[PDB]
Design an enzyme around this catalytic site. Structure first.
Site, PDB file in Angstrom:
ATOM      1  N   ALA A 123      -7.446  -3.829   6.073  1.00  0.00           N
ATOM      2  CA  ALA A 123      -8.457  -3.638   5.065  1.00  0.00           C
ATOM      3  C   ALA A 123      -9.860  -3.490   5.787  1.00  0.00           C
ATOM      4  O   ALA A 123     -10.686  -2.649   5.484  1.00  0.00           O
ATOM      5  CB  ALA A 123      -8.665  -4.927   4.186  1.00  0.00           C
ATOM      6  N   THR A 142       0.857  -1.264   0.000  1.00  0.00           N
ATOM      7  CA  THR A 142       0.000   0.000   0.000  1.00  0.00           C
ATOM      8  C   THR A 142       0.824   1.216   0.000  1.00  0.00           C
ATOM      9  O   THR A 142       1.735   1.420   0.801  1.00  0.00           O
ATOM     10  CB  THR A 142      -1.106   0.088   1.093  1.00  0.00           C
TER      11      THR A 142
END
Lengths: 245, 232, 212, 248, 252, 195, 245, 241
Positions: free
Chosen positions: C49, C1
């Site tokens: 997430a 990420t």
């Protein structure tokens, strides 16, 4: 009356009774006749469930309900109120089976039910019960028949009776002590139960009835309670009609 | 005396309570429904009420399940608490046991729940009658639930305002509808005749009819408008 | 990420990846890593997430409840601080949070707060959060100008995703651009990293390792 | 009227009806009294047999709360027993871990008081039926005597009395009390005062009289320690009371 | 009746606990709120009887809720104590959670919420206190003035009297107050507030408490010398006006 | 990483606190506020464990403000310092900790003396006019006290503090990105620039 | 007697008189009218003025419950405060769980479910709110699966859908007038001037906007509470229209 | 009538219950605390007495709650015990928490909230007690307050409660010298106590007394409940004995 004494269940009268408990007994009287007959090898329970209209479905509403598979109980008075004492009774029954891995003895059940009625008179925020409950079965010691009052008094019986037509029943039960000092054998007592309820139905006459009989017998229902239905019940019906005539 | 007109924890000299008796009154001021059943179907027909002609009428049929359902006659507040409870039990039986809850078995749970409030001094006692239908393993059954908790299995019964004429329709035609099986059309028509007589100084209209049907071949479905202007 | 954000005069540019990685496998190549909190506030999804998704929409329930109760638009500061309280309670439960709350309102100017799951509320002007937040800082800090045009600000965040995507092992996918004005986030389209990389290689004269 | 169908509201002349009735309940009891001297404390009571066949010898109405502190009552019999139970428990907790030996007299009185007070506080609770006397001996305030009222207040006294014969006992004690009395002298006052109350039955079988004076290592149950202090409380037997009862 | 508990209304729709609460307000000291355009002056009657009675340590009739919002009150003083601490802890707690200054509209709404919750319940009774809550926030230079009621009602009024003999002050206040231009002069807002409270005290300016709130967190409590300065100027104008009225009569 | 400095001069208390905050191997910003005013004349600089500094700082600030506002006169630095210490002393015996070391530098108006207290992460209140925590106190226990003249002024203490900072950058591998120096006096609290 | 003291005592109607009295609380309250059309629902209210100091435009009586839901109200604001805070949470919680609009009918159920609490406890409902609610709301919104729907949440029973419903003091005369003047041919603009036409008739004060407040639910617009200028304009069009006819 | 629970209101918008607690004071003893710049005196009168009553080695209407603050009692004594114990517990919390002695204004303020709480909540009595608080804090020096049975406090320089409050008050405010002295407090108190009390010769075994001084043995506050023979000395000066 006034000055307490019935206005709460805690408060006591100078007479040695409680007039609120007297109106509960009146409610058992108003309810439909139930009898139980103790035998030297079983117990038979019968109930009068009156028919008020033919809109009812026959053999579908009763006051006979089973506890475990070998303790029969039947109630008179306020109908949903007798149901409830059986519903809690059923809970009490289960606890005992789980913990001790044994079926409940009938005098053991007898102690436990009457503690529920008594708890409902120690508190002014709990309405007593207003139902009598005829009960019994076959256990370790053989067959036993009991009845419990809405006072929270109970004793063992040879023949027991409650409800509206209980005036007849009591009389037929007495004829039986003399007739049989064994209180009658369990097979012939299913027929004896039907005849009793028919004389009792002369005190309710303006209406029809439905008769349900159940039994639990040592070796003629095999230690287990099962409902008297079928060709058995119809023979019981035929005996009753014959001897009443 | 009527020192007992306040106490629900204290017996009245008759052996009743007045509170339970008044609860029957509530049903009388309540809205009419006629039940009836057969082996393979059961039907509830109920009257919708309105306060005016800009009202879009009160649901008198609540779907409890897809195979069971109920109607009401009496206090709508009390009807809500018991409807909540009732759906919670039917879903419980489908969750744990993959089982339909029997009509008769449901009714015994509702019984303890009426008498709990009678025993207590806390919260309102009930004052609505429910006519219950279902279709289980033992075919269609019709129970009349009372706010006392007494549950009564009949072939036809009625509660609500001016319900004594529904019992008279049903008594006469008791056998007509035992013989009909497999025709949902016939059983629906029979309730409609029934509730015309029940009512007095009223007439039925299209949108006053709510007919709820379940059986062995008919899924739980509610018919309104054009699906009930075929049996008026 | 790699998620990153920076304030400029004309608003806040929030540039994100789209690459989701679970293990040495790629979980998805489409996943929007901006959660739209309400039509004025954007948060981001980096860390867990699951955590970022639920708590930011929940965050959205608090934002909506605030406007309904008082009829005043929430502060940027009011929202972050509330997510600071919320994440601390659920601390010690394996919780994660690596979200930047950004918005620009008429009572506070452009503002960005970092929220961390350890109860941290950190003020800044330039933030980058993720695993590859480091790469995002190197390029972006050095070409950072407060006095900067919208077309150019956009270009800058894009290029921060492109260099960060390239040299990290957990990033890429596509480049999703959002610009928060006073009237909230405006979408600026989705630019695939794959094709995009090649046009930018030529224009700049950068990324001198591959020729296509 | 409504100031003792409820406990919330008060008489406009002060106090609940419940408290004034709780005092009536005290006087319906046996007579108990205490006299403090400067080398002792006597505590004395009568016991109604209330049947020729009742044994009041098997339950005495002078009961040690802790070994150095006994108590009596005047008022309702059932109410005394639970109240005594709670006295024994709180005493260990409150000071037999703070001082590792039994409490001061003074301390146990402030504790007892809170319990009496709490039943005067709210509706759906009634006052206790008794007023107690707690006498004891500690080394920090010396000999003491107290009266503990079911209102939730307590008063220390030199001599006082309570019960059915209280009003007669009180004037009597005023006259015969002096500045220095002996323990023996205070026992000789105590018998005369209680005899005014009941006469035609007075003997030490029916009258129980006992003292708080000095230690008894004989009621301690051990010896061999240079610092040991045995029960300040001591029971006289039926025979010993007779020796004092002759002495009048 | 229907006055036995809070679980019974009367058939008019009233609950007599609330109606006796409104009579309660009238028992304790008076309060006046009067808004300007850059101020709100929130003034209240200070009760003194005896010389012994201090005005140092003695409980103030203005309590600072925060550093920009203040509350003065009317009713039972004993009742209002629980209400005063509660409102301040809530005041700080807003700022703990959000990190924002104490919004006035939120503040009245929560405070009247405390009162409402008791009224909703039957086992507990609310306070018989109605408050005035005046303030500004750093984000507003437009003044707000609020009221609470012992029911659980919150209202907004331009200008207000509550408490001891409100009624006569109430009509005086209406005429002078303009919604056209509320007193833009700060000194004149205080002076109006002094004239209003003047009516209910009888003689006093050690029994008049004036306190002033202005924007951006400025709060003051006005010394005894300044309250006495208003009275000399205000008596001079009232008297002057009166002499003149009798001259208009002489002229005709 | 994360230092807090303190000196008591005879008319002010001077607290310094790092502008640097590091979570991971990343410095998140080179401007970070890491000191909060409890009331307008008492200042808490704070440093300690990851994100506990933030939760604990706002929790403590709010309580002191409530008590200052409640009393209607700001509490002494003496009242303030026991309270903060007592929260910490409960926490290490509770099932959730906070391990945050702090300095209270107030100007006490009650007796007119500046007051620097040293409050431990452990939760130990001891008064010291040269206190310091973490890895700072390993260098500045000795630096302050070597140069320390028994009377002090705001002027004297600032040059000596600047010097202290100049040693720390050199002998730690750390970066504090300078330090902000907020000065606590009888005129309230102010920010003044330094190395 | 023992009928108006107690929430657990029914009377000879089989009702509570707790429940009865709360209707009369709404009639105490100011007049509020809602009128449904297929263009949007229009929610109008009355406010009162007895003082020139009373700011009535700085406190609310039409409130937003979501972003397409509005409500009008009548009765006590105390009973209303609890009801609207509750109703705010129900819509908000819906967007959390599904990420969709709340439906109009289901918002009504939740408000009447609070209403049910009148006492202290019950089996199947914990009660913590110890009086009747002396407030009703007209609940208007839009779902997509029907259209625009307008409901009356009753504190005393279950909920009744209306196409136009008046509450408050002037409810009585308004209801007759809406039967003869609500029609499905009437546009958004007509809906506004209808409410003001009824509104004045039962007002004991002149028709002006400091005692009035209209609003609409248009999904396209979101829930919009109006300005003062728009309402002022419309009082003038209403009078010019009726001056000429 | 309104008497059933404290959750109700009479038509004065108060409660009848509060009035009943008020009256409880005016059948107990008389209590006077006079403040001076040089010390505060607390005084109470005994409402029972005998010669076989122990009252010469004890007090009962005088408690120190910490070594800087003391209280006097007027009301029923049964009510008193519970709330004294709680004030004293609150003081030692203050001492534990802040490392210093409580202010007078808070300690009283708490106690006042608690009385009101039993009015506010439940069907539980109001506690009909009036306590005279005489304290020291280094913020407002000496502070004299009293606490109402309704549960509010008001500051003072002299006050009387108990029996015949009105009679007592007029007499106290007449003879109040404006600087005042602890020696004049002590002197005034005996004189005022005499006239209310139903005995014509006031006596020391009928007296409870505490004087608080920081004006001798400065830099520290020492509070002294007087011993019986000292009380006798001050009585001899006022010429009563």
């Amino acid at each position: 009356i006034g000055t307490g004494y019935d206005l709460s269940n805690s408060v006591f009268s100078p007479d040695g009774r409680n007039f609120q408990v007297e109106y509960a007994v009146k409610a058992v009287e108003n309810g439909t006749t139930s009898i139980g007959i103790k035998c030297n090898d079983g117990v038979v329970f019968a109930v009068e469930k009156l028919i008020t209209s033919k809109l009812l479905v026959p053999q579908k509403n009763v006051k006979i309900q089973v506890v475990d598979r070998h303790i029969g109980c039947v109630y008179s008075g306020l109908i949903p109120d007798g149901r409830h004492l059986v519903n809690r009774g059923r809970e009490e029954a289960a606890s005992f089976k789980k913990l001790y891995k044994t079926p409940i003895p009938i005098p053991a059940f007898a102690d436990r039910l009457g503690q529920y009625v008594q708890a409902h008179t120690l508190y002014n925020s709990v309405r007593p019960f207003g139902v009598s409950t005829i009960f019994g079965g076959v256990d370790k010691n053989g067959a036993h028949l009991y009845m419990l009052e809405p006072s929270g008094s109970y004793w063992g019986y040879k023949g027991a009776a409650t409800g509206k037509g209980r005036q007849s029943a009591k009389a037929e039960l007495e004829k039986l002590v003399d007739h049989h000092p064994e209180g009658l054998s369990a097979r012939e007592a299913v027929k004896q139960a039907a005849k009793i309820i028919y004389l009792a139905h002369e005190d309710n006459k303006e209406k029809d009835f439905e008769l349900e009989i159940s039994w639990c017998s040592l070796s003629e229902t095999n230690g287990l309670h099962k409902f008297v239905k079928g060709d058995l019940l119809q023979e019981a019906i035929d005996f009753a009609q014959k001897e009443i005539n | 005396r009527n020192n007992y007109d306040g106490d629900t924890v204290t017996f009245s000299p008759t052996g009743r309570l007045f509170q339970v008796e008044y609860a029957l009154e509530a049903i009388k001021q309540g809205s009419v429904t006629v039940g009836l059943r057969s082996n393979t179907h059961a039907v509830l027909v109920a009257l919708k009420r309105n306060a005016d002609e800009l009202s879009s009428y009160q649901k008198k049929i609540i779907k409890c399940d897809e195979h069971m359902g109920l109607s009401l006659a009496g206090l709508a507040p009390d009807a809500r608490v018991l409807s909540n409870y009732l759906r919670q039990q039917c879903n419980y039986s489908s969750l744990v046991f993959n089982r339909k809850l029997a009509v008769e078995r449901a009714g015994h749970l509702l019984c303890d729940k009426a008498q709990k409030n009678t025993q207590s001094y806390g919260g309102r006692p009930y004052g609505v009658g429910l006519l219950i239908i279902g279709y289980d393993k033992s075919g269609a059954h019709l129970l009349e639930f009372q706010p006392s908790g007494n549950v009564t299995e009949l072939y036809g019964t009625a509660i609500g305002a001016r319900s004594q004429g529904a019992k008279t329709y049903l008594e006469r035609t008791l056998d007509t509808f035992i013989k009909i099986d497999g025709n949902p059309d016939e059983l629906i028509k029979a309730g409609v005749e029934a509730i015309s007589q029940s009512l007095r100084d009223e007439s039925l209209t299209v949108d006053n009819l709510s007919i709820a049907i379940v059986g062995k071949d008919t899924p739980f479905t509610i018919y309104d408008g054009e699906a009930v202007a075929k049996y008026i | 990420t790699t998620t990153l954000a920076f304030r400029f005069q004309g608003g806040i540019i929030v540039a994100v990846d789209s690459r989701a990685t679970a293990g040495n496998w790629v979980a998805s190549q489409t996943v929007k890593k901006v959660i739209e909190i309400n039509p004025f506030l954007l948060g981001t999804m980096a860390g867990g997430a699951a955590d970022c998704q639920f708590w930011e929409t929940w965050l959205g329930s608090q934002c909506r409840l605030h406007e309904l109760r008082e009829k005043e638009r929430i502060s940027v500061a009011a929202a972050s601080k509330i997510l600071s309280n919320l994440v601390y309670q659920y601390k010690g439960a394996g919780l994660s949070m690596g979200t930047m709350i950004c918005g620009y309102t008429r009572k506070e100017g452009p503002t960005i707060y970092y929220v961390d799951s350890d109860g941290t509320r950190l003020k800044g002007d330039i933030f980058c959060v993720g695993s590859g937040q480091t790469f995002a800082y190197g390029v972006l800090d050095s070409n950072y100008k407060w006095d900067l045009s919208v077309e150019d600000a956009l270009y800058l965040g894009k290029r921060s995703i492109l260099a960060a995507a390239h040299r990290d092992a957990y990033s890429g996918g596509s480049v999703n651009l959002y610009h928060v004005t006073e009237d909230g986030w405006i979408y600026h389209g989705n630019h695939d990293v794959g094709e995009l990389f090649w046009k930018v290689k030529e224009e700049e004269g950068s990324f001198n390792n591959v020729i296509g | 009227d409504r100031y003792s169908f409820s406990l919330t509201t008060f008489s406009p002349s002060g106090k609940l009806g419940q408290i004034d009735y709780a005092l009536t309940a005290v006087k319906q009891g046996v007579t108990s009294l205490g006299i403090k001297a400067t080398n002792g404390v006597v505590i004395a009571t009568e016991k109604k047999s209330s049947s020729p066949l009742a044994m009041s010898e098997t339950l005495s109405k002078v009961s040690l709360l802790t070994p150095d502190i006994g108590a009596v009552y005047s008022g309702m019999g059932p109410d005394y027993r639970v109240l005594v139970d709670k006295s024994r428990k709180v005493a260990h907790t409150s000071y037999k871990r703070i001082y590792g030996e039994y409490p001061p007299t003074k301390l146990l009185v402030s504790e007892v008081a809170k319990i009496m007070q709490e039943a005067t506080q709210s509706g759906g609770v009634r006052p206790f039926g008794v007023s107690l006397l707690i006498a004891g001996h500690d080394e920090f305030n010396g000999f003491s005597l107290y009266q503990v009222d079911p209102s939730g207040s307590y008063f220390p006294w030199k001599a006082t009395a309570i019960g059915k014969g209280s009003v007669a006992a009180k004037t009597f004690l005023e006259k015969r009390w002096n500045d220095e009395l002996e323990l023996e002298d205070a026992i000789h006052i105590a018998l005369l005062t209680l005899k005014e109350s009941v006469e035609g039955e007075f003997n030490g079988d029916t009258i129980e009289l006992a003292i708080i004076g000095d230690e008894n290592p004989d009621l301690l149950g051990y010896t061999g320690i240079p610092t040991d202090k045995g029960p300040r409380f001591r029971k006289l037997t039926s025979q010993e009371i007779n020796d004092r009862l002759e002495a009048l | 009746g229907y006055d036995r508990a809070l679980s019974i209304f009367s058939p008019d729709g009233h609950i007599f606990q609330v109606e006796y609460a409104l009579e309660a307000v009238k028992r304790g000291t008076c309060a006046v709120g009067v808004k300007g355009k850059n101020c709100v002056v929130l003034g209240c009657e200070r009760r003194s009887t005896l010389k012994l009675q201090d005005t140092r340590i003695t409980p103030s009739k203005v309590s600072k809720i925060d550093s920009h919002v203040v509350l003065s009150f009317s009713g039972l003083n004993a009742d209002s104590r629980i209400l005063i601490e509660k409102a301040r802890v809530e005041a700080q707690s807003h700022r703990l959670t959000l990190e924002d200054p104490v919004t006035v509209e939120y503040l009245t709404r929560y405070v009247a919420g405390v009162q409402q919750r008791y009224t909703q319940s039957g086992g507990v009774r609310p306070f018989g206190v109605s408050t005035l809550i005046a303030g500004f926030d750093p984000r507003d230079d437009e003044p707000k003035l609020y009221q609470t009621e012992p029911s659980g009602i919150y209202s907004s009024w331009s200008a207000q009297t509550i408490g001891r003999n409100s009624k006569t002050v109430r009509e005086f206040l209406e005429k002078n107050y303009d919604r056209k231009e509320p007193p833009a002069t700060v000194e004149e807002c205080v002076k109006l507030t002094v004239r209003s409270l003047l009516e209910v005290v009888q003689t006093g300016a050690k029994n008049i408490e004036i306190t002033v709130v202005k924007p951006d967190s400025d709060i003051v409590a006005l010394s005894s010398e300044e309250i006495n300065q208003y009275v000399t100027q205000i008596e001079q104008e009232k008297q002057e006006q009166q002499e003149q009225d009798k001259k208009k009569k002489s002229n005709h | 990483m994360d230092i807090i400095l303190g000196i008591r001069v005879q008319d002010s208390v001077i607290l310094a606190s790092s502008k640097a905050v590091t979570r991971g191997i990343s410095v998140l910003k080179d401007s970070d506020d890491k000191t909060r005013q409890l009331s307008p004349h008492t200042l808490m600089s704070f440093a300690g464990e990851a994100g506990d500094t933030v939760q604990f700082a706002e929790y403590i600030q709010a309580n002191i403000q409530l008590y200052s506002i409640r009393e209607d006169y700001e509490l002494s630095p003496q009242a303030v310092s026991s309270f903060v210490r007592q929260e910490l002393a409960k926490s290490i015996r509770s099932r959730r900790p906070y391990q945050v070391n702090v300095l209270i530098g107030g100007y006490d108006k009650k007796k007119n003396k500046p007051e620097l207290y040293q409050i431990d992460y452990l939760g130990t209140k001891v008064e010291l006019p040269y206190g310091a925590h973490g890895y700072s106190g390993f260098y500045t226990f000795s630096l302050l006290d070597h140069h320390y003249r028994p009377d002090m002024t705001t002027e004297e203490g600032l040059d000596l503090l600047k010097l202290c900072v100049q040693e720390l950058e050199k002998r730690m591998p750390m970066d504090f990105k300078g330090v902000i120096v907020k000065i606590v006096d009888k005129d309230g609290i102010r920010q003044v620039d330094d190395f | 007697s023992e009928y108006d003291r107690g929430v657990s005592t029914f009377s000879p109607e089989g009702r509570l008189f707790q429940v009865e009295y709360s209707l009369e609380a709404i009639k105490l309250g100011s007049t509020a009218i809602g009128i449904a059309t297929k263009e949007g629902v229009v929610l109008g209210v009355e406010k009162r003025a007895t003082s020139p100091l009373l700011e009535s435009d700085s406190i609310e009586k039409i409130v937003e419950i979501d972003r397409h839901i509005g409500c009008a109200m009548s009765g006590l604001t105390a009973d209303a405060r609890s009801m609207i805070e509750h109703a705010r949470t129900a819509a908000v919680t819906h967007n959390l769980y599904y990420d969709e609009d709340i439906n109009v009918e289901s918002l009504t159920q939740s408000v009447c479910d609070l209403a049910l609490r009148f006492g202290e406890g019950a089996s199947g409902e914990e009660r913590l709110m110890s009086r009747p609610f002396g407030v009703a709301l007209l609940i208007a919104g839009h779902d997509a699966d029907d259209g625009y729907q307008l409901f009356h949440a009753e504190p005393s029973g279950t909920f009744y859908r209306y196409n136009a419903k008046a509450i408050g003091s002037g409810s009585e005369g308004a209801q007759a007038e809406l039967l003869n003047e609500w029609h499905s041919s009437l546009t958004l603009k007509e809906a506004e001037l209808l409410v003001l036409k009824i509104l004045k008739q039962v007002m004991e004060e002149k028709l002006d906007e400091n005692n009035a407040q209209l609003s609409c639910i248009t999904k396209q617009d979101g829930f919009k509470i109006y300005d003062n200028e728009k309402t002022a304009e419309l009082i003038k069009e209403l009078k010019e229209k009726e001056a000429a006819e | 009538r309104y008497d059933s629970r404290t959750t109700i209101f009479s038509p004065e918008g108060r409660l009848y219950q509060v009035e009943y607690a008020l009256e409880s004071i005016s059948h107990a003893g008389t209590a006077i605390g006079i403040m001076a710049s040089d010390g505060i005196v607390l005084a109470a009168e005994r409402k029972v007495t005998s010669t076989l009553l122990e009252q010469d080695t004890s007090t009962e209407k005088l408690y120190k709650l910490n070594d800087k603050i003391a209280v006097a009692v007027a009301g029923l004594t049964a009510d008193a015990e519970i709330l004294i114990n709680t004030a004293r517990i609150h003081a030692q919390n203050y001492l534990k928490t802040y490392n210093e002695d409580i202010p007078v204004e808070i300690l009283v303020r708490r106690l006042s909230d608690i009385k009101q709480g039993y009015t506010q909540h439940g069907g539980l009595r109001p506690f009909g007690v009036s306590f005279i608080y005489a304290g020291y804090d280094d913020r407002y020096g000496y502070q004299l307050y009293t606490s109402n049975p309704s549960g509010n406090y008001t500051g003072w320089k002299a006050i009387s409660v108990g029996a015949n409050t009105s009679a007592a008050q007029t007499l106290l405010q007449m003879d109040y010298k404006d600087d005042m002295k602890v020696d004049d407090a002590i002197e005034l108190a005996l004189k005022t106590l005499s006239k209310t009390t139903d005995s014509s010769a006031l006596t020391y075994d009928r007296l409870e007394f505490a004087t608080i001084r920081k004006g001798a043995n400065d830099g520290e506050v020492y509070q002294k409940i007087f011993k019986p023979q000292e009380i006798k000395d001050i009585l001899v000066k006022t010429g009563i004995t």
